[PDB]
Coordinates of C-alpha atoms and ligand atoms in Angstrom, one line a residue:
Chain A
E8 CA 126.9 109.1 27.9
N9 CA 126.5 105.4 28.6
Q10 CA 124.5 104.7 31.8
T11 CA 125.1 100.9 31.6
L12 CA 128.9 101.4 31.7
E13 CA 128.5 104.0 34.6
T14 CA 126.5 101.4 36.6
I15 CA 129.2 98.8 35.9
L16 CA 132.0 101.2 37.0
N17 CA 130.1 102.4 40.1
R18 CA 128.9 99.1 41.5
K19 CA 130.4 98.2 44.9
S20 CA 129.8 95.6 47.7
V21 CA 127.4 97.1 50.2
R22 CA 127.3 95.4 53.6
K23 CA 125.2 97.9 55.7
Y24 CA 121.5 98.7 55.1
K25 CA 118.7 100.9 56.2
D26 CA 116.1 99.1 58.2
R27 CA 113.3 99.2 55.6
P28 CA 112.5 96.2 53.4
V29 CA 113.0 96.2 49.7
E30 CA 109.8 96.3 47.6
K31 CA 108.7 93.0 46.1
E32 CA 108.6 94.6 42.6
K33 CA 112.3 95.5 43.0
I34 CA 113.2 91.9 44.2
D35 CA 111.4 90.5 41.1
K36 CA 113.4 92.8 38.8
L37 CA 116.6 91.6 40.5
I38 CA 115.6 88.0 39.7
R39 CA 114.6 88.8 36.2
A40 CA 118.0 90.4 35.6
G41 CA 119.7 87.3 36.9
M42 CA 117.7 85.0 34.6
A43 CA 118.7 87.1 31.6
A44 CA 122.3 85.8 31.9
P45 CA 123.9 83.8 29.1
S46 CA 124.0 80.0 29.6
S47 CA 126.1 77.2 28.3
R48 CA 124.0 75.4 25.7
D49 CA 121.1 77.5 27.0
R50 CA 120.4 75.1 29.8
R51 CA 119.4 77.8 32.3
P52 CA 120.5 75.9 35.3
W53 CA 119.9 78.6 37.9
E54 CA 117.5 78.6 40.9
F55 CA 116.9 81.7 43.1
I56 CA 115.9 81.5 46.7
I57 CA 114.3 84.7 48.2
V58 CA 114.9 84.5 52.0
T59 CA 112.9 86.7 54.2
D60 CA 112.5 84.3 57.2
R61 CA 114.2 86.0 60.2
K62 CA 115.2 82.7 61.9
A63 CA 116.8 81.4 58.6
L64 CA 118.7 84.7 58.0
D65 CA 120.0 84.8 61.6
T66 CA 121.0 81.1 61.6
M67 CA 123.0 81.6 58.4
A68 CA 124.6 84.7 59.7
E69 CA 125.7 82.8 62.8
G70 CA 127.2 80.0 60.7
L71 CA 128.9 82.1 58.0
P72 CA 132.0 84.0 59.1
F73 CA 132.0 86.4 56.1
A74 CA 128.2 86.9 55.9
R75 CA 127.4 88.3 59.4
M76 CA 125.5 91.1 57.8
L77 CA 122.6 88.7 57.1
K78 CA 121.5 89.6 60.7
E79 CA 121.1 93.2 59.6
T80 CA 118.9 92.8 56.5
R81 CA 115.3 91.8 55.9
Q82 CA 116.1 90.0 52.6
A83 CA 118.7 88.0 50.8
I84 CA 118.8 86.1 47.5
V85 CA 120.6 82.8 47.2
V86 CA 121.7 81.9 43.7
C87 CA 121.9 78.1 43.1
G88 CA 122.9 75.9 40.3
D89 CA 121.3 72.7 39.2
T90 CA 124.2 70.2 38.8
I91 CA 122.1 67.7 36.9
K92 CA 121.1 70.4 34.2
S93 CA 124.7 71.6 33.8
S94 CA 127.4 69.7 35.7
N95 CA 130.2 71.5 33.9
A96 CA 128.8 75.1 33.5
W97 CA 126.3 75.9 36.3
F98 CA 129.0 77.7 38.3
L99 CA 129.8 79.9 35.2
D100 CA 126.1 80.6 34.2
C101 CA 125.2 81.3 37.8
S102 CA 128.2 83.6 38.3
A103 CA 127.0 85.6 35.2
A104 CA 123.4 85.6 36.7
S105 CA 124.8 86.9 40.0
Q106 CA 126.6 89.7 38.3
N107 CA 123.4 90.8 36.4
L108 CA 121.7 90.8 39.8
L109 CA 124.3 93.0 41.5
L110 CA 124.2 95.5 38.6
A111 CA 120.4 95.5 38.6
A112 CA 120.6 96.3 42.4
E113 CA 123.1 99.2 41.8
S114 CA 120.8 100.5 39.0
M115 CA 117.8 100.7 41.3
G116 CA 119.5 102.4 44.2
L117 CA 120.0 99.2 46.2
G118 CA 123.0 97.8 47.9
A119 CA 124.1 94.2 47.7
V120 CA 127.1 92.0 48.2
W121 CA 128.1 88.6 46.8
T122 CA 129.0 86.3 49.8
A123 CA 130.5 83.0 48.8
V124 CA 129.0 79.6 49.6
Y125 CA 130.5 77.2 47.0
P126 CA 133.2 75.9 46.9
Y127 CA 133.5 75.8 50.8
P128 CA 131.9 72.7 52.2
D129 CA 131.1 74.3 55.6
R130 CA 129.3 77.1 54.0
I131 CA 127.5 74.8 51.7
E132 CA 126.4 72.6 54.6
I133 CA 124.6 75.4 56.5
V134 CA 122.9 77.0 53.5
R135 CA 121.7 73.6 52.2
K136 CA 120.4 72.7 55.7
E137 CA 118.6 76.0 56.4
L138 CA 117.0 76.2 53.0
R139 CA 116.3 72.4 52.5
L140 CA 118.2 72.4 49.2
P141 CA 118.0 69.0 47.3
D142 CA 121.3 67.2 46.7
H143 CA 121.4 68.2 43.0
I144 CA 121.0 72.0 43.9
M145 CA 124.3 73.7 44.8
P146 CA 124.3 77.1 46.4
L147 CA 126.8 79.5 44.8
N148 CA 126.3 82.5 47.1
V149 CA 124.2 84.5 49.5
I150 CA 123.4 88.0 48.3
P151 CA 122.0 90.3 51.0
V152 CA 120.2 93.2 49.6
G153 CA 118.9 96.5 51.1
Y154 CA 118.8 100.3 50.8
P155 CA 122.4 101.5 51.5
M156 CA 122.7 103.1 55.0
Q157 CA 125.5 105.5 53.8
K158 CA 127.4 106.8 50.7
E159 CA 129.7 104.1 49.4
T160 CA 132.4 104.6 46.8
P161 CA 133.5 102.1 44.1
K162 CA 137.0 100.7 43.8
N163 CA 138.9 101.6 40.7
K164 CA 140.4 98.3 39.7
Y165 CA 141.9 99.3 36.2
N166 CA 145.4 97.9 35.8
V167 CA 147.0 98.1 32.3
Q168 CA 149.4 95.3 33.4
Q169 CA 146.5 92.8 33.3
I170 CA 146.1 93.6 29.5
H171 CA 148.1 91.4 27.0
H172 CA 148.2 91.4 23.2
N173 CA 148.2 88.3 21.0
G174 CA 149.7 86.1 23.8
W175 CA 150.9 86.4 27.4
Chain B
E4 CA 113.4 104.3 32.6
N5 CA 116.3 102.0 33.6
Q6 CA 118.9 101.8 30.8
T7 CA 121.1 99.3 32.7
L8 CA 118.2 96.9 33.1
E9 CA 117.3 97.5 29.5
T10 CA 120.8 96.4 28.4
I11 CA 120.7 93.4 30.7
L12 CA 117.4 92.2 29.3
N13 CA 118.3 92.9 25.7
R14 CA 121.8 91.4 25.7
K15 CA 122.1 88.4 23.3
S16 CA 124.8 86.2 21.9
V17 CA 125.9 87.6 18.6
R18 CA 127.8 85.2 16.3
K19 CA 127.7 87.0 12.9
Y20 CA 129.5 90.3 12.4
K21 CA 130.1 93.1 9.9
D22 CA 133.5 92.6 8.3
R23 CA 135.3 95.5 9.9
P24 CA 137.5 96.1 13.0
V25 CA 136.3 97.5 16.3
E26 CA 137.7 100.8 17.6
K27 CA 140.5 100.4 20.1
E28 CA 138.8 102.7 22.5
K29 CA 135.7 100.4 22.6
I30 CA 137.9 97.3 23.2
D31 CA 139.6 99.2 26.1
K32 CA 136.2 100.0 27.6
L33 CA 135.2 96.4 27.4
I34 CA 138.2 95.5 29.5
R35 CA 137.7 98.3 31.9
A36 CA 134.2 97.0 32.4
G37 CA 135.6 93.5 33.1
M38 CA 138.1 94.8 35.7
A39 CA 135.2 96.4 37.6
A40 CA 133.8 93.0 38.6
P41 CA 133.5 91.9 42.2
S42 CA 136.3 89.6 43.4
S43 CA 136.7 87.0 46.2
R44 CA 138.9 88.6 48.9
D45 CA 139.5 91.4 46.3
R46 CA 142.3 89.2 44.8
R47 CA 141.5 90.5 41.2
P48 CA 142.9 87.4 39.5
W49 CA 141.8 88.3 36.0
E50 CA 144.1 88.7 32.9
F51 CA 142.8 89.8 29.5
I52 CA 144.4 88.8 26.1
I53 CA 143.4 90.9 23.2
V54 CA 143.7 88.7 20.1
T55 CA 144.0 90.3 16.6
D56 CA 146.5 87.9 15.0
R57 CA 144.7 86.2 12.1
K58 CA 146.5 82.8 12.5
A59 CA 145.7 82.8 16.3
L60 CA 142.0 83.5 15.7
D61 CA 141.7 80.9 12.9
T62 CA 143.6 78.3 14.9
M63 CA 141.2 78.6 17.9
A64 CA 138.3 78.7 15.5
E65 CA 139.5 75.4 14.1
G66 CA 140.3 73.7 17.4
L67 CA 137.4 74.8 19.6
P68 CA 133.9 73.5 19.1
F69 CA 131.2 76.1 18.6
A70 CA 133.9 78.8 18.0
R71 CA 133.6 79.2 14.1
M72 CA 132.8 82.9 14.4
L73 CA 136.5 83.5 15.5
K74 CA 137.2 83.3 11.7
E75 CA 134.7 86.1 11.1
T76 CA 135.9 88.8 13.6
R77 CA 139.0 90.9 13.6
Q78 CA 139.4 90.8 17.4
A79 CA 138.6 88.5 20.4
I80 CA 139.2 89.0 24.1
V81 CA 140.3 85.9 26.1
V82 CA 139.5 86.1 29.8
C83 CA 142.0 84.3 32.0
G84 CA 142.5 83.7 35.7
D85 CA 145.7 83.6 37.8
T86 CA 145.3 80.4 40.0
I87 CA 148.1 81.5 42.3
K88 CA 146.2 84.7 43.1
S89 CA 142.9 82.9 43.5
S90 CA 143.1 79.2 43.7
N91 CA 139.5 78.4 44.7
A92 CA 137.5 81.2 43.1
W93 CA 139.3 82.6 40.0
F94 CA 136.7 81.2 37.6
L95 CA 133.8 82.8 39.5
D96 CA 135.6 86.2 39.6
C97 CA 136.4 85.8 35.9
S98 CA 132.8 84.9 35.0
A99 CA 131.6 88.1 36.7
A100 CA 134.2 90.0 34.7
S101 CA 133.1 88.3 31.5
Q102 CA 129.4 89.3 32.1
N103 CA 130.4 92.9 32.6
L104 CA 132.3 92.7 29.3
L105 CA 129.3 91.3 27.5
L106 CA 127.0 93.9 28.9
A107 CA 129.5 96.7 28.0
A108 CA 129.6 95.3 24.4
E109 CA 125.7 95.4 24.1
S110 CA 125.6 98.9 25.6
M111 CA 128.0 100.2 22.9
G112 CA 126.1 98.7 19.9
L113 CA 128.6 95.8 19.6
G114 CA 127.9 92.1 19.4
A115 CA 129.7 89.4 21.5
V116 CA 129.4 85.8 22.6
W117 CA 131.0 83.7 25.4
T118 CA 132.6 80.8 23.8
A119 CA 133.5 77.9 26.1
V120 CA 137.1 77.0 27.0
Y121 CA 137.0 76.1 30.7
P122 CA 136.5 73.5 32.1
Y123 CA 137.4 71.3 29.1
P124 CA 141.1 70.3 29.2
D125 CA 141.5 69.8 25.4
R126 CA 140.1 73.3 24.9
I127 CA 142.2 74.8 27.6
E128 CA 145.2 73.2 26.0
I129 CA 144.4 74.8 22.5
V130 CA 144.2 78.3 24.0
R131 CA 147.2 77.8 26.3
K132 CA 149.5 76.7 23.4
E133 CA 148.2 79.3 21.0
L134 CA 148.6 82.2 23.5
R135 CA 151.7 81.0 25.3
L136 CA 149.9 81.1 28.7
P137 CA 152.0 80.2 31.7
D138 CA 150.8 77.2 33.6
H139 CA 149.4 79.2 36.5
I140 CA 147.2 81.2 34.1
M141 CA 143.9 79.4 33.1
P142 CA 141.9 80.5 30.1
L143 CA 138.1 80.8 30.9
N144 CA 136.7 81.6 27.5
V145 CA 137.1 83.4 24.2
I146 CA 134.9 86.4 23.5
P147 CA 134.8 87.5 19.8
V148 CA 133.5 91.0 19.5
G149 CA 132.1 92.8 16.4
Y150 CA 129.5 95.1 14.9
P151 CA 126.4 92.8 14.5
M152 CA 125.8 91.8 10.9
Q153 CA 122.0 91.9 11.5
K154 CA 119.2 92.7 14.0
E155 CA 119.2 89.9 16.6
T156 CA 116.5 88.9 19.1
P157 CA 117.1 88.5 22.8
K158 CA 115.6 85.5 24.6
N159 CA 113.0 86.0 27.4
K160 CA 114.3 83.5 30.0
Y161 CA 111.9 84.5 32.9
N162 CA 110.5 81.4 34.6
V163 CA 108.6 81.7 37.9
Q164 CA 109.3 78.0 38.6
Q165 CA 113.0 79.0 39.2
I166 CA 112.0 81.4 42.1
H167 CA 111.7 79.9 45.6
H168 CA 110.6 81.6 48.9
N169 CA 112.5 80.8 52.1
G170 CA 113.9 77.5 50.9
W171 CA 113.4 75.1 48.1
Ligands
LIG18 C1 129.5 79.2 30.1 C2 129.0 79.5 28.7 C3 129.5 78.8 27.6 C4 129.1 79.1 26.4 N1 129.7 78.4 25.3 C5 129.4 78.8 24.0 C6 130.1 78.4 22.9 O1 131.1 77.6 23.0 N2 129.8 78.8 21.6 C7 128.7 79.6 21.4 O2 128.4 79.9 20.3 N3 128.0 80.1 22.5 C8 128.3 79.7 23.8 N4 127.6 80.3 24.8 C9 126.5 81.2 24.6 C10 125.1 80.5 24.9 O3 124.8 79.5 23.8 C11 124.0 81.5 25.1 O4 124.3 82.3 26.2 C12 122.6 80.9 25.2 O5 122.2 80.3 24.0 C13 121.6 81.9 25.6 O6 121.5 82.9 24.5 P1 121.8 84.4 24.8 O7 123.2 84.6 25.2 O8 121.5 85.0 23.4 O9 120.8 85.0 25.8 C14 128.1 80.0 26.1 C15 127.6 80.7 27.3 C16 128.1 80.5 28.5 C17 127.5 81.2 29.7
LIG19 C1 133.3 84.7 44.4 C2 133.2 85.9 45.3 C3 133.1 85.6 46.7 C4 133.0 86.6 47.7 N1 132.8 86.3 49.0 C5 132.5 87.3 49.9 C6 132.2 86.9 51.2 O1 132.1 85.8 51.7 N2 131.9 87.9 52.1 C7 131.9 89.3 51.8 O2 131.7 90.1 52.6 N3 132.2 89.6 50.5 C8 132.5 88.6 49.5 N4 132.8 89.0 48.2 C9 132.8 90.5 47.9 C10 134.3 90.9 47.7 O3 134.9 91.1 48.9 C11 134.3 92.2 46.9 O4 133.8 92.0 45.6 C12 135.7 92.8 46.7 O5 136.2 93.2 48.0 C13 135.8 93.9 45.7 O6 134.9 95.0 46.2 P1 133.7 95.6 45.4 O7 132.6 94.5 45.2 O8 133.1 96.7 46.2 O9 134.2 96.1 44.0 C14 132.9 88.0 47.2 C15 133.0 88.3 45.8 C16 133.1 87.3 44.9 C17 133.2 87.7 43.4
LIG20 CL1 140.8 102.7 16.5

């Protein structure tokens, strides 16, 4: 039995949460998981914003068409990249960090969903505004987290036709 | 005890391998792990090239910087994205897929490393011409896989200065 592989295969996007907040110890483990990502030339260009402010969460919800569930959580994490530290890899490093965070969540009985910010200038504008992100800090995503309100089922995405040998 | 977190925190880039091939069933599980990634609009734009041809591995080892370990493995997995399927987010989706693949490797006692291809045009061209990739298919990386030659140490990347509360 491989519990890591099981978490990987059972992870799903969770968009509905119980009312209760997530414990600070669990939030910190989510962050620590993200920071364990690999990183081009080990620059470590990620920055994590833990957002619990009701007004900010609601304002972002009301400006992000595919992130309306921000109104229905008490906490979200915004993964950002520092474009001075890694102008050609922050979006790769931070995507790997994001995936660690989502797996960490699944592993601790939490629900989470990756909602895009970058590369959409309208989404970037509101997130940068509400969180006072400096010009060299680019928000990749908003990740609401919470205890799942119901049983959710993973997608089975295996497709042998997306496997190739020695060339296309 | 959280085995998934344990794997996340103990993953490291492994660049030195036992001179022996990896079981096909393990390679398949790597790819299944990759395919389980989240995907913008569920467009699943990933394509995986399993590379066992010696000349292909050696040619990429020669042409790519920081890719010398390709000479020392029997097999590598090249993660690619279909830009017609996901023109704005393929490389984000494919980075999440890549991180699943790396974690899967670590969980099965294998060693792996992300070697950079995207976003460097000269690197992209090497991989494209070696693997006969159609123009709408972009190579993200090359991931050599093997049994680790030696015990390797993970990095502790935790830094509280990269954690922010309610904004920058
Ligand atoms: C986007 C990206 C590009 C990378 N490029 C290379 C590469 O070309 N060659 C290599 O040996 N390692 C490469 N790495 C691995 C990093 O050097 C490594 O993740 C970093 O040193 C942190 O070490 P760790 O993976 O052991 O935690 C890359 C990693 C990422 C995420
Ligand atoms: C780059 C990226 C952007 C995404 N953007 C959003 C988004 O804006 N809103 C949302 O509800 N889900 C978003 N998703 C979640 C996807 O819809 C989801 O991963 C996909 O439907 C597959 O489902 P699964 O995560 O349950 O396997 C995003 C995922 C990725 C990887
Ligand atoms: Cl075999």
